[PDB]
Each structure stands twice: as C-alpha cells, then as structure tokens.
Ligand binder design. Structure first.
Ligand SMILES: [Cl-]
Ligand SMILES: [Cl-]
Ligand SMILES: [Cl-]
Ligand SMILES: [Cl-]
Ligand code: NA
Ligand code: NA
Length: 129
C-alpha cells in the first residue's frame, strides 16, 4: 500500500518510533518518503548483490534474509519478504535494531542525504497526532 504522510506518522507513532534512540517522529516519516515514496512494496537492487526492501528500504546484506545475497548476516532475523507487508510492524521492529547499531539513522542513505539537517518536524506538522 501507499501511505499518506499523516497516516504513516500515526502508524509509526503507534509503533513507538517517535524519539526512538533519539530520533523524533519526523525523521522517520521523512526517511520513508525519500526511501520508498511511502510504498510498502518498494524494492531496489544494489551493486553488491543486495536488495533494499519496503517502506524503509531495509538492506538484505546486513539486516534481512532474502536467500540471494552474499555475505548476508540477517541481523534482524527476518525474511526480507515479510518487510513487504502492508502492515509496517516487521519493518519498524527491524528499523529499531538498525538505528541501535551504533550509527543512528545514517544507514538510511535517503534520510542521510535529503532529511538530515532539514526541519523534519515539518513532516508531522498538521497531523495532530
Ligand atoms: Cl519531528
Ligand atoms: Cl525473502
Ligand atoms: Cl501498519
Ligand atoms: Cl517482526
Ligand atoms: Na513500541
Ligand atoms: Na539518496
């Protein structure tokens, strides 16, 4: 499915992402906009054999198992296919592990390039959560 901005903000807040590991809710909403365009089914292949999956474009080299990526670590202990569900639970649970790895939200390339340093509160503005 394709989330609306405030719809995703609400869902992400219900799933405990607001201020998680020091990152306010707008960071997560912005990340999702630029990672997947709010589409839970977005996938993108990479040069190293990996693929990024779902609303938060979680990578199969480190985080989820897709059975076709070399050097896979499956640190979220989740099949990548589960991260393409319209329900964001598996993606959020994995994201929480990723952001806890010791480099914050920098693992999200689109967040790093297009969200970090901007006023991310704007992403939840008007949502009255
Ligand atoms: Cl925010
Ligand atoms: Cl898979
Ligand atoms: Cl959901
Ligand atoms: Cl899960
Ligand atoms: Na929670
Ligand atoms: Na980018």
């Amino acid at each position: 499915k394709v989330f609306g901005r405030c719809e995703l903000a609400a869902a992400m807040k219900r799933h405990g992402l607001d201020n998680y590991r020091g990152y306010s809710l707008g960071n997560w909403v912005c990340a999702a906009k630029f990672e997947s365009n709010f589409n839970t089914q977005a996938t993108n292949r990479n040069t190293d054999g990996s693929t990024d999956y779902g609303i938060l474009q979680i990578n199969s080299r480190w985080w989820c198992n897709d059975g076709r990526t070399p050097g896979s670590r499956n640190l979220c202990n989740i099949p990548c296919s589960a991260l393409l569900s319209s329900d964001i639970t598996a993606s959020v649970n994995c994201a929480k592990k990723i952001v806890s790895d010791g480099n914050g939200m920098n693992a999200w390339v689109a967040w790093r390039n297009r969200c970090k340093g901007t006023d991310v509160q704007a992403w939840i503005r008007g949502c009255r959560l």
